[PDB]
């Protein structure tokens with residue numbers, strides 16, 4: 001049971017498909033607090049328009065303040081074109097790059113699904129498990145291991 | 148989407164392939180920044196390059212000469228008969244992401260990667276579709292402000 | 297198939313980072329890697345560090361942090377990704393594999409790939425030495441030793 | 449309507465599928481000269497075994513001399529294995545990297561086709577349009593805009 | 596290029612050891628072609644091996660940092676299996692080999708085979724009526740090594 005009362009965590013989330021984003025952020029926040037003793041005042045939450053902006057928003061934020069771990073949250077749903085595949089591939093590499101360039105643990109809270117239902121299910125609705133909870137724990141664990 | 152950026156300097160680089168779709172996209176972006184976010188016309192630079200492949204390179208060259216708070220890269224790639232479309236799309240997207248992360252300047256994705264021309268026009272606001280350029284205009288202002296201030 | 301060496305690395309310091317998803321398959325892999333280095337290459341138990349991270353996504357990051365603090369001759373990254381219902385599997389697998397390659401090239405430290413990217417659980421267990429399969433961890437142990445010695 | 453009498457242009461082309469390569473190179477050269485007033489003596493032409501060497505040949509050459517723009521030309525045809533897919537992906541990312549790293553515009557004269565007929569058609573044979581011309585014009589434009 | 600001779604060239608060859616049946620002929624073809632057709636000296640050709648294709652980029656990087664080579668040939672054979680392992684390793688190795696060559700300035704020749712089954716690999720190694728691809732790689736190493744001088 002890892003506890004991180006002194007950890008400063010950053011959460012950057014996109015605003016596309018808010019129906020699925022909100023639950024994810026909550027589950028992450030609630031879990032860090034209620035289960036890892038992270039302090040609410042130590043959790044910064046920022047948003048960007050879409051998943052494409054996630055890597056950029058995180059990079060700008062960890063250059064200004066100091067965080068022990070970051071959680072990038074976004075929901076990409078396959079559409080009619082190849083837009084979904086290209087954005088997904090670029091964003092995932094971008095998030096990995098920002099983490100490796102900065103030395104700050106970047107947790108993957110990106111969902112890349114085929115339809116809305118799949119997203120809601122992974123956000124804890126319709127009998128599914130909220131994946132945000134897992135991301136909060138990973139944030140805490142990686143943040144501690146980085147000291 | 149309420150944000151105002153009267154002091155923001157925005158750069159728009161667009162390719163010239165599939166101009167039928169490019170033009171509306173650029174207008175929607177410009178119009179939205181101006182009428183909805185108070186950006187000043189004189190603070191918006193517009194440049195062009197032959198194709199989407201040049202977008203990353205054109206943007207890189209420009210943000211090295213002047214100072215911008217945000218950049219919008221606009222291009223239209225349509226699937227053809229070869230694998231050309233797939234390889235260019237992949238490299239361009241990775242290039243635009245790199246330019247943004249290397250420079251610290253927000254780069255907005257105004258790239259359409261479609262199966263046929265009808266899909267592009269529809270996303271440019273023609274034939275009953277929503278003009279995606281508008282969303283790009285708003286995103287540029289938002290990311291520009293979250294960096295300058 | 298592979299062609300391991302008989303090389304001995306009694307002075308080698310080896311690091312093993314593994315994720316914790318699908319532990320059923322992870323455990324046998326790690327054991328095989330450790331046992332093989334020790335019993336077959338003369339690596340010393342005390343010279344093998346073992347760390348863990350939540351998921352495969354964390355592997356490149358955990359390895360990067362660890363080789364920045366201590367000095368290792370070789371690193372083995374171990375994780376198990378199983379195709380699910382979304383495209384999550386494809387995108388994480390691609391990013392992690394490129395990430396592990398980058399950490400190895402940036403640092404100069406050999407990073408051994410102990411990542412399984414499978415369609416279902418049965419395939420993972422089979423590659424972990426269960427149900428009549430060959431334990432791939434063993435091969436990784438020999439590779440770690442071989443690369444660690446060629447870096448000296 | 450762009451003219452570049454002082455531009456120095458480099459062309460690196462592979463030698464696999466020369467039947468398609470030659471016309472592509474000619475089209476690019478002819479167009480730069482005849483339509484953009486580029487001078488014959490200001491156009492260097494080099495070759496490398498295959499498309500895989502394109503990025504490397506270009507990087508080496510722009511480190512020795514000064515060019516305003518580079519055109520990389522090569523032809524990849526899908527074969528029986530996955531070789532085509534992996535080389536294509538690596539070469540394209542390689543050419544983009546060299547352009548961004550060096551600051552010198554790199555024009556994409558790479559064809560990634562399914563069979564030989566497709567390549568010849570794009571080289572102007574059998575009633576097709578010679579793509580090399582477009583690459584010549586793009587080189588001139590990007591070379592001028594780099595100043 | 597007429598007939599290139601490189602009697603003073605120093606060439607490095609790193610090959611993996613998976614699927615040796617196909618590897619050996621590939622290496623021979625490359626060595627023989629360099630010596631017999633390009634006048635490269637046997638004593639100027641270093642040959643190293645690594646467990647698998649995943650180690651090629653790393654093995655090559657370590658070696659060119661210790662000695663000086665005019666060109667490098669990376670040889671490995673990947674065969675599609677029952678999982679997605681082949682696809683991910685192939686993509687990462689190919690990008691890794693391109694990176695090492697561009698980072699170092701030393702030409703890295705691609706002697707990697709990414710096939711669907713063993714038969715395809717043997718064929719490309721010169722068995723069963725096929726053309727030994729290692730020969731072409733040898734000539735490419737010599738040509739690129741000379742053009743770097």
Ligand SMILES: O=c1[nH]c(NC[C@H](O)[C@H](O)[C@H](O)CO)c([N+](=O)[O-])c(=O)[nH]1
Pocket residue numbers: 014015016049050051052053074075076077079087254255256257283286
């Ligand atoms: O986070 C998402 N962003 C999306 N917008 C695209 C992109 O993230 C940027 O907001 C904008 O394209 C300019 O950068 C999506 N779609 O377009 O479908 C989506 O599904 N999810």
Ligand SMILES: O=c1[nH]c(NC[C@H](O)[C@H](O)[C@H](O)CO)c([N+](=O)[O-])c(=O)[nH]1
Pocket residue numbers: 162163164197198199200201222223224225227231235554555556557583586
């Ligand atoms: O912007 C585009 N550029 C295209 N040209 C490719 C590239 O952008 C350059 O113009 C040229 O290849 C040399 O750099 C396209 N097609 O070829 O189809 C396309 O659909 N869209």
Ligand SMILES: O=c1[nH]c(NC[C@H](O)[C@H](O)[C@H](O)CO)c([N+](=O)[O-])c(=O)[nH]1
Pocket residue numbers: 106107108109135138315316317350351352353354375376377378380384388
């Ligand atoms: O190692 C794995 N990690 C997984 N977790 C995802 C990721 O590795 C991180 O733990 C988390 O996503 C945010 O960092 C997996 N799935 O989700 O399926 C999986 O199959 N294997």
Ligand SMILES: O=c1[nH]c(NC[C@H](O)[C@H](O)[C@H](O)CO)c([N+](=O)[O-])c(=O)[nH]1
Pocket residue numbers: 462463464497498499500501522523524525527531535703704705706732735
């Ligand atoms: O330019 C090409 N090079 C090719 N050769 C591969 C590569 O470009 C190098 O010459 C050599 O592989 C070593 O780097 C091709 N095929 O193999 O099919 C091809 O179609 N086109």
Ligand SMILES: O=c1[nH]c(NC[C@H](O)[C@H](O)[C@H](O)CO)c([N+](=O)[O-])c(=O)[nH]1
Pocket residue numbers: 407408409410436439611612613646647648649650671672673674675676680684
């Ligand atoms: O060179 C190869 N290496 C292989 N081994 C994988 C890898 O190259 C590493 O040696 C090891 O996986 C961890 O470093 C292969 N397969 O697994 O199938 C293969 O086909 N070819």
